[PDB]
Every structure is written in structure tokens, then in C-alpha cells.
Design a protein around this motif. Structure first.
Motif, short mmCIF file in Angstrom:
data_model
loop_
_atom_site.label_atom_id
_atom_site.label_comp_id
_atom_site.label_asym_id
_atom_site.label_seq_id
_atom_site.Cartn_x
_atom_site.Cartn_y
_atom_site.Cartn_z
N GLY A 176 50.03 -50.50 -60.89
CA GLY A 176 50.95 -50.25 -61.99
C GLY A 176 51.29 -48.79 -62.21
N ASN A 177 52.46 -48.53 -62.77
CA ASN A 177 52.89 -47.17 -63.08
C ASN A 177 52.69 -46.85 -64.60
OD1 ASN A 177 55.32 -49.09 -62.46
ND2 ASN A 177 56.16 -47.66 -63.95
N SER A 178 53.04 -45.63 -65.07
CA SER A 178 52.90 -45.20 -66.47
C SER A 178 54.25 -44.67 -66.99
CB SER A 178 51.85 -44.11 -66.60
OG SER A 178 50.72 -44.32 -65.77
N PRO A 179 55.20 -45.57 -67.31
CA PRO A 179 56.53 -45.10 -67.72
C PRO A 179 56.62 -44.62 -69.17
CG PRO A 179 56.53 -47.48 -67.62
CD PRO A 179 55.13 -47.04 -67.25
N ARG A 180 57.59 -43.76 -69.43
CA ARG A 180 57.84 -43.23 -70.77
C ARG A 180 59.17 -43.84 -71.23
NH1 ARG A 180 56.48 -38.39 -73.56
NH2 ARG A 180 58.08 -37.78 -75.09
N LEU A 181 59.10 -44.86 -72.10
CA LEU A 181 60.28 -45.59 -72.56
C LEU A 181 60.61 -45.34 -74.04
CD1 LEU A 181 59.31 -48.95 -70.87
CD2 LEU A 181 60.96 -47.30 -70.00
N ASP A 182 61.91 -45.37 -74.38
CA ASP A 182 62.35 -45.23 -75.76
C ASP A 182 62.65 -46.63 -76.24
OD1 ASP A 182 62.15 -42.45 -75.94
OD2 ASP A 182 64.26 -42.09 -75.41
N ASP A 216 60.12 -58.07 -81.91
CA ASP A 216 60.74 -58.01 -80.60
C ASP A 216 61.18 -56.59 -80.24
OD1 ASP A 216 60.39 -60.78 -80.45
OD2 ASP A 216 62.40 -61.21 -81.21
N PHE A 217 60.57 -56.00 -79.20
CA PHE A 217 60.90 -54.67 -78.73
C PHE A 217 62.22 -54.67 -77.95
CE2 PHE A 217 56.20 -53.99 -79.10
CZ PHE A 217 56.19 -52.82 -79.78
N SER A 218 62.92 -53.54 -77.96
CA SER A 218 64.16 -53.42 -77.21
C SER A 218 64.35 -52.00 -76.68
CB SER A 218 65.36 -53.82 -78.07
OG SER A 218 65.52 -52.96 -79.18
N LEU A 219 65.02 -51.86 -75.53
CA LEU A 219 65.25 -50.53 -74.96
C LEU A 219 66.38 -49.78 -75.65
CD1 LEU A 219 64.57 -50.98 -71.16
CD2 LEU A 219 63.18 -49.80 -72.82
N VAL A 220 66.14 -48.50 -75.92
CA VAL A 220 67.11 -47.58 -76.51
C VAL A 220 67.46 -46.55 -75.43
CG1 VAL A 220 67.39 -45.77 -78.26
CG2 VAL A 220 66.21 -47.91 -78.86
N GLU A 221 68.76 -46.23 -75.26
CA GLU A 221 69.16 -45.25 -74.25
C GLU A 221 69.91 -44.07 -74.87
OE1 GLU A 221 68.34 -45.26 -70.94
OE2 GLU A 221 67.98 -47.35 -70.35
N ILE A 235 42.24 -55.56 -64.03
CA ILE A 235 43.19 -54.72 -63.31
C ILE A 235 43.20 -53.35 -63.97
CG2 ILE A 235 45.52 -54.45 -62.42
CD1 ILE A 235 44.27 -57.10 -61.61
N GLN A 236 42.83 -52.31 -63.25
CA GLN A 236 42.81 -50.96 -63.79
C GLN A 236 44.18 -50.31 -63.72
OE1 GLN A 236 39.24 -48.90 -63.26
NE2 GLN A 236 40.18 -46.89 -62.96
N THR A 237 44.62 -49.67 -64.81
CA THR A 237 45.92 -49.01 -64.84
C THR A 237 45.90 -47.83 -65.79
OG1 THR A 237 48.28 -49.61 -64.67
CG2 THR A 237 47.15 -50.29 -66.71
N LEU A 238 46.88 -46.92 -65.67
CA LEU A 238 46.99 -45.80 -66.58
C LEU A 238 48.23 -46.12 -67.38
CD1 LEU A 238 45.83 -42.61 -66.85
CD2 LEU A 238 48.24 -42.25 -66.45
N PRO A 239 48.08 -46.40 -68.69
CA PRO A 239 49.26 -46.77 -69.47
C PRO A 239 50.25 -45.63 -69.66
CG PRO A 239 47.19 -47.28 -70.64
CD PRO A 239 46.87 -46.34 -69.52
N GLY A 240 51.46 -46.01 -70.04
CA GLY A 240 52.53 -45.10 -70.37
C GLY A 240 52.71 -44.99 -71.86
N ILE A 241 53.88 -44.53 -72.30
CA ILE A 241 54.17 -44.34 -73.71
C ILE A 241 55.43 -45.09 -74.11
CG2 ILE A 241 54.90 -42.53 -75.37
CD1 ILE A 241 51.91 -42.47 -74.64
N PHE A 242 55.33 -45.87 -75.19
CA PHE A 242 56.43 -46.55 -75.84
C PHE A 242 56.69 -45.60 -77.00
CE2 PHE A 242 56.71 -51.53 -75.79
CZ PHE A 242 57.04 -51.51 -74.46
N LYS A 243 57.80 -44.86 -76.97
CA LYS A 243 58.10 -43.93 -78.06
C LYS A 243 59.03 -44.58 -79.07
CE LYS A 243 60.50 -39.70 -79.13
NZ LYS A 243 61.23 -38.51 -78.61
N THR A 244 58.62 -44.64 -80.35
CA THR A 244 59.39 -45.28 -81.43
C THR A 244 59.64 -44.31 -82.63
OG1 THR A 244 57.63 -46.39 -82.75
CG2 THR A 244 58.24 -47.49 -80.70
N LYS A 245 60.48 -44.73 -83.59
CA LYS A 245 60.80 -43.93 -84.78
C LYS A 245 59.60 -43.75 -85.74
CE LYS A 245 62.98 -47.20 -87.99
NZ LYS A 245 61.85 -48.13 -88.28
#
Ligand SMILES: N#C[C@H](Nc1ccc2c(c1)CNC2)c1cncc2ccccc12
Lengths: 39, 156
Positions: A20-26, A34-39, B94-104
Motif C-alpha cells: 500500500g501507498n500513503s496518499p495525501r487527499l483533500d 460519507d467522505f468525498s474528494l475535494v479538488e 497487512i503492514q502499511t504506512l498510512p496517509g493523510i485525509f485532510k479536512t476542514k
């Protein structure tokens, strides 16, 4: 009608599959949980 | 019935055969799962009954028999382990390095592993084996794959 069956202990496994990867999502979380993608 | 600590599958016999709709965590006599797995309905454990105690559609979490007990948090740095319990398949770390969900309202950890919808409620762990959150609530990215948040409740 729901039921539960045991699936094992909660333990850390050394030498486990590393994937797995470590993405930075808005994202935005609405009133219904319910989560949703912001661009 | 059985209240021993550990990971549990959440099953239903309402559909064809026996279908796995999710997973949950038993700790200190409290079953912890995601709200979309049970929709707040009472569960069964052998002959015993598990009644909902606390729940919230926005946080997407629900506790049974008692208040939410899981209170560990991802340190924003270390690798974590998803104890994924998929439908019909054996539990597997399953080992993983999490990411970031950035919110308001703030940042939240996110595990980018794709598993069936019935895997919802699987615990995510720190190096101590402590439950830092549950898997199964997130988003669908440009690649089609699923990215789940590390959803943790509040211990009152
Ligand atoms: N089942 C389910 C998930 N849907 C969902 C997730 C969160 C919420 C709801 C539905 C209702 N509101 C909160 C879901 C959907 N698509 C792919 C998934 C992959 C892994 C695990 C859960 C997934």
C-alpha cells in the motif's frame, strides 16, 4: 438478523506483508458519514 | 455468549446462504463495529444477545453492551497493521504506512488497502497491538481503488 463468529486475536505480526501507498487527499465529511474528494 | 477479546466477523442469514457484512472488535466486554455494518441493529452471539449502547452515523461507529473502550491514536509517523478479516478468508495482518485525509476540522490517518465491503470493521493496529481505529469508511480515488480513514471513537 445478524450474528458474530470469532476470527482470532488482535496482535502485531512481525514479518507481515508490507504493501500500500500513503496518499495525501483533500476530503469532506457530510452529515451521513460519507467522505468525498475535494479538488 | 462468548465475550472473549479479539476480532469477530459480523454475519447475516437474511440473504442467500451466510453472508459476511462486516467485522468488529471485542474489548472489555464491548463489541465495537462501524455503523454501516449493523445499521444499529442488535447482534447475536450463540444464545446471547448484544444490544447497542452508543452509536453515531457521522462518526460511523457503534458500541454494544457498553461505552466505546478503544482510545489509541496513530502517532502520525509509524507504520501500522490492518488486521483484515475478509469474507470467507482467514484473518491476516497487512503492514502499511498510512496517509493523510485532510479536512476542514483537522487531519486523519488513511490506509490505502483495497478489500471487499464485508471487510468493514477490521481493526488497524500500532506496534503495541493497540486498536488505533477501524477500517471501512473512506473514498474512491482516480485509480478506482479504495482509501479508508483510521476511524477512532472517544472513550468517555
Ligand atoms: N460497506 C461498505 C463501504 N461503504 C460505506 C462506507 C462508509 C459508510 C457507508 C457505506 C454508509 N455511510 C458510512 C465500502 C464501499 N466501497 C468499498 C469499500 C471497500 C472496503 C470497505 C468498505 C467499502
Amino acid at each position: 438478523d445478524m450474528y458474530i463468529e470469532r476470527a482470532g486475536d488482535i496482535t502485531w505480526e512481525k514479518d507481515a506483508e508490507v504493501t500500500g501507498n500513503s496518499p495525501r487527499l483533500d476530503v469532506a465529511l457530510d452529515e451521513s458519514g460519507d467522505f468525498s474528494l475535494v479538488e | 455468549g462468548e465475550t472473549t477479546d479479539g476480532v469477530y466477523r459480523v454475519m447475516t442469514r437474511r440473504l442467500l446462504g451466510s453472508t459476511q457484512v462486516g467485522v468488529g472488535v471485542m474489548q472489555e466486554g464491548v463489541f465495537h463495529t462501524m455503523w454501516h455494518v449493523t445499521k444499529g441493529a442488535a447482534l447475536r452471539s450463540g444464545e446471547g444477545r448484544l444490544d447497542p449502547y452508543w452509536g453515531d452515523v457521522k462518526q460511523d461507529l457503534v458500541s454494544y453492551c457498553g461505552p466505546w473502550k478503544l482510545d489509541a491514536a496513530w502517532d502520525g509517523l509509524s507504520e501500522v497493521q490492518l488486521l483484515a478479516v475478509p469474507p470467507g478468508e482467514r484473518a491476516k495482518n497487512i503492514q502499511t504506512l498510512p496517509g493523510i485525509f485532510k479536512t476542514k476540522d483537522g487531519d486523519i490517518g488513511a490506509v490505502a488497502l483495497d478489500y471487499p465491503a464485508g471487510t468493514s470493521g477490521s481493526p488497524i493496529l500500532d506496534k503495541c497491538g493497540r486498536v488505533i481505529g477501524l477500517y471501512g469508511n473512506g473514498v474512491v480515488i482516480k485509480n478506482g481503488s479504495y482509501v479508508s480513514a483510521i476511524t477512532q471513537g472517544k472513550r468517555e
